[PDB]
């Protein structure tokens, strides 16, 4: 689990969104595994606006933050899971790192701010849904 809190937005994995998220919906995209809802309180996270390919992510199944090198956002085939059939997910970045299903939502960040959230993984890989192109999160 986990979310990004920027301005009056809450960014979560679409597959982990709550009823309150759907009832206060701003935007959602199944192909990216992202959903954004509105919040009453202002958040403290800032979004990175950069082309970093190195950063640090939070892994809840280890209670640890790990430095990683990650690929550029792209269209990647993701195996069937409890939440989606096998399909191509867009704007996804891959790295070598530990992950388990409940690690989705952990933040990946660089020197500029939040880059994205854990969305996929298995067998010593972790994938992150990029948010750096979502310029409207800043206004
Ligand atoms: C960190 O995630 C994992 C790690 C190990 C094994 C599996 C996962 C997550 C599996 N997935 C992929 C998600 C998606 N399509 O974006 C939906 C889902 O349930
Ligand atoms: Zn950066």
Curated annotation (Swiss-Prot):
Signal peptide: none annotated. It comes from the Viruses. It catalyses: Selective cleavage of Tyr-|-Gly bond in the picornavirus polyprotein. Zn(2+) 1 binds at residues 50, 52, 110, 112. Disulfide bonds: none annotated. The active site is at 15 (for protease 2a activity), 33 (for protease 2a activity), 104 (for protease 2a activity). Homodimer. Cysteine protease that cleaves viral polyprotein and specific host proteins. It is responsible for the autocatalytic cleavage between the P1 and P2 regions, which is the first cleavage occurring in the polyprotein. Also cleaves the host translation initiation factor EIF4G1, in order to shut down the capped cellular mRNA translation. Inhibits the host nucleus-cytoplasm protein and RNA trafficking by cleaving host members of the nuclear pores. Counteracts stress granule formation probably by antagonizing its assembly or promoting its dissassembly. This is Protease 2A. The chain holds residues 869 to 1007 of 2193 of the full protein.
């Amino acid at each position: 689990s986990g979310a990004i809190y920027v301005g009056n937005y809450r960014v979560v994995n679409r597959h982990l969104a709550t009823h309150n998220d759907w009832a206060n919906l701003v935007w959602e995209d199944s192909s990216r595994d992202l959903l954004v809802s509105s919040t009453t309180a202002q958040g403290c996270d800032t979004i990175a606006r950069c082309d970093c390919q190195t950063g640090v992510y939070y892994c809840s199944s280890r209670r640890k933050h790990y430095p990683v090198s990650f690929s550029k956002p792209s269209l990647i085939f993701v195996e069937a899971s409890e939440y989606y059939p096998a399909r191509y997910q867009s704007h996804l970045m891959l790295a070598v790192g530990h992950s388990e299903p409940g690690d989705c939502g952990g933040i990946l960040r660089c020197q500029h701010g939040v880059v994205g959230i854990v969305s996929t993984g298995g067998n010593g890989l972790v994938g992150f849904a990029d948010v750096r192109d979502l310029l409207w999160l800043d206004e």
